[PDB]
Design a protein around this ligand. Structure first.
Ligand SMILES: *[B]([O])([O])[C]([C][C]([C])[C])[N]C(=O)[C][N]C(=O)C1=[C]C(Cl)=[C][C]=C1Cl
Ligand SMILES: *[B]([O])([O])[C]([C][C]([C])[C])[N]C(=O)[C][N]C(=O)C1=[C]C(Cl)=[C][C]=C1Cl
Ligand SMILES: [Cl-]
Ligand SMILES: [Cl-]
Ligand SMILES: [Cl-]
Ligand SMILES: [Cl-]
Ligand SMILES: [Cl-]
Ligand SMILES: [Cl-]
Ligand SMILES: [Cl-]
Ligand SMILES: [Cl-]
Ligand SMILES: [Cl-]
Ligand SMILES: [Cl-]
Ligand SMILES: [Cl-]
Ligand SMILES: [Cl-]
Ligand SMILES: [Cl-]
Ligand SMILES: [Cl-]
Ligand SMILES: [Cl-]
Ligand SMILES: [Cl-]
Ligand SMILES: [Cl-]
Ligand SMILES: [Cl-]
Ligand SMILES: [Cl-]
Ligand SMILES: [K+]
Ligand SMILES: [K+]
Ligand SMILES: [Mg+2]
Ligand SMILES: [Mg+2]
Ligand SMILES: [Mg+2]
Lengths: 248, 234, 204, 202, 230, 244, 220, 239
């Protein structure tokens, strides 16, 4: 029925896809989520929105998802949509392992999901998924990698990036502080906290309010770990001591 | 207005504007005439020519040995319906080894053409047909419409300025039953001629004739083959 | 017989706080040995292994498709799969093919990922599970294996004694079977380590 | 199996033996082969136990629904036609030899045979199953037009007893039912209540 | 055939308004409460029950999913009945495959996923319900909420429906980690009294509990007893 | 809020800004278009349905004008609201019951039948392409353990069992009448069940009936088969009431 | 297999042996053949083991969905209909031969169910390759309205008759007793067979087995 | 607006698309049925829109089974499609159950098919009302009428189309319970002549059919000579 169809998969007069753009507005309001590539690893750091006192803390993270043995992601946008996409990511990665008996290379996983997102903009008459994703991974072709995808089904690779609230401000801080070829997991961790400290300007930054995951290689094996709160408090402490030095 | 775009939307006066609009396609077609006697059924059609160098559109179509049609409205819809009629006739010969009775064929058309008038996104057929046939019940002239209704006729005309042709046919219809073939065709031609601007005449380029009856399979006459019928409109 | 086309034998066996699983190493086609290092035992966890005997192509397919399911299960759930739950997962996979089955009859051996209690079982080709407290056997020399296991196995054996018993059960059983052998591999599973050995074995 | 039904003025009598066999093992020695399909309509079942139970359950369903929709008792002819439709349609996958009998207010007592293959014919009396072979002659000689209900019961019990004596696949108890406007009356003949005919000693 | 286009879409400010409006149906529902004690979970709800004419026992808001899992809701009752049925079926499908009762979180994830579908799939509106789901597995109690978007959250205690914002602040100033189940049942009922209007009987509230023995509804006579102190 | 509207929320079953479903609300109004009221009451021994029987036209065969339907031999029903919608819901209940019996081997309990019908109605409130049915079903039957039962379900897909209930134009007034009467009764339970139903109906309409102006159907613990009273049977009740 | 059931005064007694065979080899000595259907209904299984397992699990599950919905304890007739309609649909290719017994609102009921989908409702039934041995015990000794202990004695004797006279049956006797008031799942009920004890010792000391290769992998 | 789709209720609980379809019926010329002691008689005022049409063109009286007649008013192509539905339901009933479909059941089945077209945006309601009549020794005479909403009731007398009320008021004057079909045909013809507006619509054919003891329970056209006598009685009665 033509009267009720809101026509989610058509062009506007300037060649735009409004549902896609409107979905990108939803993402820009979600929790800030950054990714940083180093020489010995990659990390994801995300603002937690689940912070009410009475929440129970039952899973290992809020927005960090393991995808397969060598990859993880984080998300900004509609949570339920993110649950659908991450489930589909895990399936794709296992279909590839089944078929080739080696892990899916990172960019091929990202591309495979992005083709699904693209299809939702072109046919079917459905709303797109209100999700942007950061992917971290290791594979044997390109080593440590960091990708970003959005509701248009576009993606790109990054050395550092940010999605969600105050992204623009976070990317400027990264542009300035990030050292191409010269970062370590320890200095990327420091930069991540520095960035979140300026972009959560509502308000004073706390371990309860962030989640950090790191991805490294130890003895021919990928290790993916969500940092315990003790470790996050220590990084925040160190960042605050560092600002004590800042003048003299 | 809000009631005129969808064949599924009844208006508040209990009409369906899409069906009425589809009937306009038939009123703007070129005229055709159908009439019958005790022994023959005749179709006469005016063929409209797009330019002086164009042939003149086919208006009369063969359905089966005992059935032909004349068309007014969307040609592509005419062909779709004609193909359905052909297939129903072939089926009845295949299964029963005898010609499909003309009135049963026309019931089939009614039932087929009704369906899209009741389903969203579908449209009526934009074509009206005059149907000439002969069977155990004698000769027949039937008329079909985009509304899916159909009519059993002594004679009929549809298309542009067809009202003149109907008036002529009412005026002389008490004569039709007892006419020989020649008389009957002439009556068809004179009715058709009433539809024309005063200047213009029936010619071998613009007239087409179809005849079926007791001794005669459905046959179409065009071009030089209509000259005998046009001579001695005297 | 379809199950003797490739030949092969697996067994598992329970001790005190430990389990053992063993397999011959022959990949052959009827009479012809093709290779002598063919894998029939596959890790489904740090302390949980599945051994498959039967048609070599289905050994491989069932191991792979099982792994696909298990990986999805572990990512979705918080956690490492329990031994009993793996059995069920495998039962379900096999019975889905009830009317055109995979020709493989697996054994599972493991320790519970939280309690470390010993677990062993076997299943038939359509997924009927059998849990035991001693041993299980599958392959073309099942009768030979039963004879050795029934005579040698004892309750509450330590890792060293379990190793000796499973080894002797396997070696002597396969030595009466034309299409099993060409080497035996044995895994002992303990809380704190896995020990993997190939045995000195007849190669005819 | 041996099954039988007989029309009388105002109703029907139905009977069956009670033996279910797999090979020559008796899996049930007291089977109830007379199954109610509606308040005054029964079927007697022979052939495959599984097939006849499944078909009877399905027809009970169809007839019950039909009867609620019409708000009237079903015709015996309608029950029979439903059996026939299913037994004819699936004749290649079913082994079912059925007798449908009952009472309705329009046509009274009626007996229909639906033998294997799915034809349907009304009869004054019907016999079926493996044991029926042994009683064609008996029933052809003994049947009389205008029998009472009680005579029909006796005639049916005698016929079934004779069949049961000779057919390895029939035996056990005789189950009888009488159906009329006033309702259904069921009984069992067992042991010494089964009519007896001496074996012929020299 | 069915409308194949989404009835929930993005507004220019990035909102899925149909989900927002579903949340407004929830907020206008009858109040519901969940409190995770140290040794169990309690779910309690008010019956929006006019009339003495109602047979209070004929339909239940607090429902078993499995031996070990139960549900209550706030918002549209008939929508809830759809989700109870699907949750039960999801729980059985799990059991047939794994031969272990479904962990509470896995059940929530699967139900939440059904709710997400109804925000995107063609020709349908979202569910106008939020669920509170309790269970016991791996030696421990769980309380979850699942909202019309398909988002789900693990709570120590919460309230939903009419006056939920105040209910939550009442629980904040009253829940503690070491609290027992018998105490928790009380505080759940007190939380309902905060927004009641009507005088509470055992016939116009429903209470369910989850512990190591399993999930069950408290009987009228058991509720009556907890109400004597309140 | 307070009667707000956006987009197509008055045309299809999508949420309004307050979270309402206008199209479902309008289906309740459609129940009243027929101008009729029904009442049902359950006691310890029976359950009863009473409804108005309006035959305005003399040319109608009044034996075909009814709102009482047999669903199974043991379940009866009264329908209120749009007539063809009601017939359709009656057929579907007949189908559900018969199918339950075939699959499960015992008669469908009245509560499960009412629930199933309600769950079917729910789909119409969540799927945009069809309207809700503008009718309300009241079912009566005997449960072996709980005694006589009265269940009602509505176009929102809500359902409930009752001591007594009503439907149609004077539903509220009937509800108040019945509430006032049970409060007075011991163990809050109706005892004179046919009388209460007819009296309730007669009060809220202000009519005082002839036996041809109402229909009455019953199920009892001693006689669980659903029964429609004849005129003469109904008249005996009207006369017993008239004299006290 | 030998499986059997009896209706007694106050309920049902079900019985079974515990042998499973693969060919003419014992594969399981302690197979559990008495399956949960619902808290008041159990089902013995004979025939193809995967099929008895899967069929009873599926029906138990669909019945749990049914009772959750009705709020009532299920009926034996219901389990019977569901099992038979499924087995009929599969035309005998699901090789489940079942003894279904329970106690419901209408009292105790016992059915035998065959792979092609026929069922018989009877006060005593037997299935499996030992079914004739067990049936002979029943024909010889069954009485109506037995007491609980008499009925348990009789079902164990009938299972024993299969265990000892049928090569397809062996090992232990399991019972299940179901009344209005009680469910006793007696596994094992009796252990009439036992492995003899080992006269020699084959405790092979470390190094007896020659080893080609070893790898220790430490875990957490 | 609230009146575009049969899947949309108006705010007062009406389905305007069904009501508009009913208006199509109410614009059509009048058809009547009368049940009497020994059957059912149908009459239709069949307006002749052109003298070029054959006598009998556009019948509004159909045989839907050998024992069942149908009389229609409204959009004729919709009515014919309904006649075909009724025919198929009767046929399929005989094939499945093995006897002639009872009238009431046929009426209820086709009513439910009509009703199915009043729920959805995907289809439009039928623009027709129709009567079904039969007779058998077992069931007596039965006359049902079905409207575009799918409501179905039984009647002693019934009229549909634009002079419906004028027709009904004349039908009420007859003691039809005590009359035979032969007497009733004359009265049907009479009533059609009464309600026909000869000023506004110039020409009509009377169409008559019946089913009753006199046709042995077969629905049949009234024979030509009986119809002519009935017309003549009606015309002189108009005097
Ligand atoms: B009778 O035709 O001999 C009798 C009638 C049935 C309807 C009771 N038939 C049989 O006994 C034929 N037997 C079976 O169908 C059967 C029974 C059992 Cl227990 C198992 C397998 C089979 Cl195929
Ligand atoms: B009994 O019917 O003899 C018994 C019942 C089961 C439930 C234990 N049946 C058997 O022992 C027959 N064997 C199996 O179904 C079987 C077959 C296969 Cl292919 C593999 C293993 C087993 Cl255990
Ligand atoms: Cl992986
Ligand atoms: Cl991988
Ligand atoms: Cl044209
Ligand atoms: Cl054209
Ligand atoms: Cl027209
Ligand atoms: Cl025209
Ligand atoms: Cl797979
Ligand atoms: Cl049987
Ligand atoms: Cl036969
Ligand atoms: Cl036969
Ligand atoms: Cl016998
Ligand atoms: Cl669409
Ligand atoms: Cl449910
Ligand atoms: Cl469970
Ligand atoms: Cl409970
Ligand atoms: Cl049934
Ligand atoms: Cl009272
Ligand atoms: Cl049954
Ligand atoms: Cl009208
Ligand atoms: K015999
Ligand atoms: K809707
Ligand atoms: Mg060897
Ligand atoms: Mg060799
Ligand atoms: Mg078969």
């Amino acid at each position: 029925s033509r009267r009720y169809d809101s026509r989610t998969t058509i062009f506007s007069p300037e060649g735009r896809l409004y549902q896609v753009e409107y979905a990108m507005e939803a993402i820009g309001h979600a929790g800030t989520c950054l990714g940083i590539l180093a020489n010995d690893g990659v990390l994801l750091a995300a603002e937690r929105r689940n912070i009410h006192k009475l929440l129970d803390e039952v899973f290992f993270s809020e927005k960090i998802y393991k995808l397969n043995e060598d990859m993880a992601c984080s998300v900004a946008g509609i949570t339920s949509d993110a649950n659908v996409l991450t489930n589909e990511l895990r399936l794709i990665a296992q279909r590839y392992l089944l078929q080739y008996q080696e892990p899916i290379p990172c960019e091929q996983l990202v591309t495979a999901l992005c083709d699904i997102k693209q299809a939702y903009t072109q046919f079917g008459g459905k709303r797109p998924f209100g999700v942007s994703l950061l992917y971290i991974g290791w594979d044997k072709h390109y080593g440590f990698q960091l990708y970003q995808s959005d509701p248009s089904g576009n993606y790109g690779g990054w050395k550092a990036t940010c999605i969600g609230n105050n992204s623009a401000a976070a990317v400027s801080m990264l542009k300035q502080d990030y050292k191409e070829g010269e970062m370590t997991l320890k200095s990327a961790l420091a930069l991540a906290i520095k960035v979140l400290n300026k972009t959560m300007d509502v308000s004073k930054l706390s371990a309860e309010k962030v989640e950090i995951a790191t991805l490294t290689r130890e003895n021919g094996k990928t290790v993916i770990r969500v940092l315990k709160q003790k470790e996050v408090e220590q990084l925040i402490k160190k960042h605050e001591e560092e600002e004590a030095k800042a003048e003299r | 207005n809000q009631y005129d775009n969808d064949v599924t939307v009844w208006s508040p006066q209990g009409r369906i504007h899409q069906i009425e609009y589809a009937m306009e396609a038939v009123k703007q077609g070129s005229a055709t005439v159908g009439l019958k006697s005790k022994t023959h059924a005749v179709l006469v059609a005016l063929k409209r020519a797009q330019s002086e160098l164009a042939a003149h559109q086919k208006k009369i179509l063969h359905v089966d040995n005992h059935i032909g049609i004349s068309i007014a409205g969307l040609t592509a819809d005419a062909r779709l319906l004609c193909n359905f009629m052909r297939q129903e006739c072939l089926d009845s010969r295949f299964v029963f080894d005898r010609p499909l009775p003309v009135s049963r064929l026309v019931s089939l058309i009614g039932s087929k053409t009704q369906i899209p008038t009741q389903r969203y996104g579908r449209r009526p057929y934009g074509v009206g047909l005059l149907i000439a046939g002969y069977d155990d019940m004698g000769p027949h002239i039937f008329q079909t419409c985009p509304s899916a209704n159909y009519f059993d006729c002594r004679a009929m005309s549809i298309g542009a300025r067809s009202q003149s042709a109907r008036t002529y046919l009412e005026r002389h219809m008490s004569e039709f039953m007892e006419c020989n073939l020649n008389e009957l065709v002439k009556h068809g031609l004179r009715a058709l001629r009433e539809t024309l601007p005063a200047e213009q005449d029936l010619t071998t380029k613009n007239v087409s004739i179809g005849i079926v009856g007791k001794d005669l399979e459905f046959t179409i006459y065009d071009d030089d083959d209509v000259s005998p019928f046009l001579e001695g409109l005297e | 017989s379809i199950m003797s086309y490739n030949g092969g034998a697996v067994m598992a066996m329970k001790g005190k706080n430990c389990v053992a699983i063993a397999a011959d190493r022959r990949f052959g086609i009827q009479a012809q040995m093709v290779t002598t290092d063919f894998q029939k035992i596959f890790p489904m966890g740090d302390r949980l292994y599945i051994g498959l005997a039967g048609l070599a192509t289905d050994v491989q397919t069932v191991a792979q498709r099982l792994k696909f399911r298990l990986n999805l299960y572990e990512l979705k759930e918080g956690r490492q799969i329990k031994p009993y739950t793996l059995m069920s997962m495998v039962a379900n996979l096999l019975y889905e093919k009830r009317f055109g089955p995979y020709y493989t009859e697996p054994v599972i051996a493991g320790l519970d990922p939280k309690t470390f209690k010993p677990f062993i079982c076997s299943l038939d080709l359509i997924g009927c599970p059998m849990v035991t407290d001693d041993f299980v056997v599958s392959g073309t020399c099942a009768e030979q294996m039963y004879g050795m296991c029934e005579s040698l196995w004892e309750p509450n054996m330590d890792p060293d004694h379990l190793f000796e018993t499973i080894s002797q059960a396997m070696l002597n059983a396969v030595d009466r079977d034309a299409v099993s052998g060409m080497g035996v591999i044995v895994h002992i599973i303990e809380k704190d380590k896995i020990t993997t050995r190939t045995l000195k074995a007849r190669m005819d | 199996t041996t099954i039988m039904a007989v029309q009388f003025d105002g109703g029907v009598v139905l009977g069956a033996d009670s033996r279910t066999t797999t090979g020559s093992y008796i899996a049930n020695r007291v089977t109830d082969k007379l199954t109610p399909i509606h308040d005054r309509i029964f079927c007697c079942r022979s052939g495959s136990a599984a097939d006849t139970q499944a078909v009877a359950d399905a027809v009970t369903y169809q007839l019950g629904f039909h009867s609620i929709e019409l708000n009237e008792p079903p015709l015996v002819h309608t029950a029979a036609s439903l059996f026939k439709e299913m037994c004819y349609r699936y004749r290649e996958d079913l082994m079912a030899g059925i007798i449908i009998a009952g009472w309705d207010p329009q046509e009274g007592g009626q007996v229909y045979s639906v033998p294997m293959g799915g034809m349907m014919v009304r009869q004054s009396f019907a016999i079926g199953g493996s044991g029926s072979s042994y009683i064609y002659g008996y029933v052809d000689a003994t049947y009389r037009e205008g029998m009472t209900k009680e005579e029909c019961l006796q005639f049916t019990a005698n016929a079934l007893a004779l069949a049961m004596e000779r057919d390895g696949s029939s035996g056990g108890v005789i189950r009888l039912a009488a159906i009329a406007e006033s309702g259904v009356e069921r009984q069992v003949l067992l042991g010494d209540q089964i009519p007896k005919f001496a074996v012929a000693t020299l | 055939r069915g409308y194949s286009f989404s009835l929930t879409t993005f507004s220019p400010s990035g909102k899925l308004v149909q989900i927002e409006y579903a949340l407004a149906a929830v907020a206008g529902g009858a109040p519901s409460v969940g409190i995770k004690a140290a040794n169990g979970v309690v779910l309690a709800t008010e019956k929006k029950q006019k009339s003495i004419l109602y047979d209070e026992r004929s339909v239940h808001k607090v429902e078993p999913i499995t031996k070990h899992i139960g549900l209550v809701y706030s918002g549209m009752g008939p929508d809830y009945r759809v989700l109870v049925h699907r949750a039960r079926k999801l729980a059985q499908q799990y059991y047939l495959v794994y031969q272990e009762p479904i962990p509470t979180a896995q059940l929530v994830q699967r139900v939440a996923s059904v709710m997400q579908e109804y925000t995107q799939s063609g020709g349908v509106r979202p569910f106008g319900v939020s669920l509170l789901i309790c269970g016991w597995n791996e030696g421990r109690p769980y309380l979850f909420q699942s909202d019309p978007s398909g988002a789900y959250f693990a709570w120590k205690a919460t309230a939903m429906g009419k006056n939920y914002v105040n209910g939550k602040t009442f629980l904040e100033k009253r829940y503690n980690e070491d609290l027992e189940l018998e105490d928790a049942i009380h505080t759940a009922i007190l939380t309902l009294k905060e927004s009641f209007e009507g005088q509470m009987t055992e016939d116009n509230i429903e209470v369910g509990i989850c512990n190591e023995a399993g999930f069950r509804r408290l009987t009228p006579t058991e509720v009556k007893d907890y109400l004597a102190a309140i | 809020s307070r009667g707000s509207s956006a987009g197509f929320d008055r045309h299809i079953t999508i949420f309004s800004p307050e979270g309402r479903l206008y199209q479902v609300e309008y289906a309740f109004k459609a129940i009243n278009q027929g101008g009729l009221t029904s009442v049902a009451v359950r006691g310890k021994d029976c359950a009863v349905i009473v409804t108005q029987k309006k035959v305005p036209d003399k040319l109608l065969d009044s034996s075909t004008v009814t709102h009482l339907f047999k669903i199974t031999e043991n379940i009866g029903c009264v329908m209120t609201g749009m007539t063809a919608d009601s017939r359709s819901q009656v057929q579907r209940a007949r189908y559900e019951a018969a199918n339950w019996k075939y699959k499960y081997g015992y008669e469908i309990p009245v509560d499960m039948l009412c629930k199933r019908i309600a769950d079917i109605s729910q789909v119409y409130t969540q799927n945009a392409e069809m309207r809700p049915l503008g009718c309300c079903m009241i079912l009566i039957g005997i449960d072996e353990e709980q005694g006589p039962q009265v269940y009602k379900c509505d176009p929102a897909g809500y359902y409930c069992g009752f001591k007594a209930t009503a439907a149609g134009v004077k539903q509220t007034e009937s509800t108040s009448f019945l509430e006032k009467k049970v409060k007075k009764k011991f163990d809050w339970t109706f005892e004179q069940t046919v009388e209460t139903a007819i009296t309730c109906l007669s009060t809220v309409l202000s009519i005082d009936f002839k036996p041809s102006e109402i229909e009455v159907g019953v199920v009892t613990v001693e006689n669980p088969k659903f029964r429609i009273l004849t005129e003469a049977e109904i008249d005996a009740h009207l006369v017993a009431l008239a004299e006290r | 297999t030998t499986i059997a059931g009896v209706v007694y005064k106050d309920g049902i007694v079900l019985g079974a042996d515990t042998r499973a065979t693969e060919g003419m080899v014992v594969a399981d000595k302690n197979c559990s053949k008495i399956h949960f259907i619902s808290p008041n209904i159990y089902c013995c299984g004979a025939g193809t083991a995967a099929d008895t397992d899967m069929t009873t699990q599926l029906i138990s599950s669909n019945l749990e969905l049914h009772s959750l919905s009705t709020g009532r304890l299920p009926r034996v007739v219901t389990a019977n209909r569901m099992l038979k309609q499924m087995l009929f649909r599969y035309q005998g290719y699901i090789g489940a031969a079942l003894v279904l017994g329970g106690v419901d609102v209408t009292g105790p009921h016992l059915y035998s169910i065959y792979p092609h989908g026929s069922t018989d409702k009877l006060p005593y039934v037997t299935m499996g390759s030992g079914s004739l041995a067990a049936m002979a015990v029943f024909e010889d000794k069954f009485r109506p309205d037995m007491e609980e202990e008499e009925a348990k004695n009789l079902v164990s004797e009938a299972i024993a008759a299969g265990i000892f006279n049928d090569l397809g049956s062996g090992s232990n006797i399991d019972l299940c007793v179901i009344s209005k008031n009680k469910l006793d799942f007696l596994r094992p009920y009796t252990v009439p067979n036992k492995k003899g004890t080992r006269l020699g010792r084959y405790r092979c000391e470390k190094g007896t087995t020659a080893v080609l290769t070893e790898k220790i992998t430490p875990l957490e | 607006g609230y009146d575009l789709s049969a899947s949309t209720f108006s705010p007062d609980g009406r389905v305007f698309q069904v009501e508009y379809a009913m208006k199509a019926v109410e614009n059509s010329s009048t058809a009547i049925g009368i049940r009497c002691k020994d059957g059912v008689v149908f009459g239709v005022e069949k307006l002749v829109l052109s003298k070029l049409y054959e006598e009998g063109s556009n019948k509004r009286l159909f045989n839907v089974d050998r024992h069942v007649g149908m009389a229609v008013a409204g959009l004729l192509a919709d009515a014919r499609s309904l006649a075909d539905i009724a025919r198929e339901e009767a046929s399929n009933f005989r094939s499945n159950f093995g006897y002639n479909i009872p009238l009431k059941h046929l009426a209820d089945r086709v009513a439910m098919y009509v009703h199915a077209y009043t729920l959805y945006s995907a289809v439009r309601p039928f623009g027709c009302s129709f009567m079904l009549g039969s007779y058998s020794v077992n069931d007596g005479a039965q006359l049902y009428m079905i409207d575009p909403s799918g409501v179905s009731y039984g009647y002693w007398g019934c009229a549909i189309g634009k002079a419906r009320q004028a027709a009904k008021t004349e039908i009420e004057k007859l003691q039809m319970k005590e009359m035979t079909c032969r007497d009733i045909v004359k009265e049907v013809a009479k009533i059609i002549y009464i309600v026909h507006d000869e000023v506004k619509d110039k020409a009509f054919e009377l169409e008559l059919s019946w089913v009753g003891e006199l046709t042995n329970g077969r629905h049949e056209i009234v024979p030509k000579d009986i119809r002519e006598e009935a017309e003549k009685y009606a015309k002189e009665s108009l005097k």
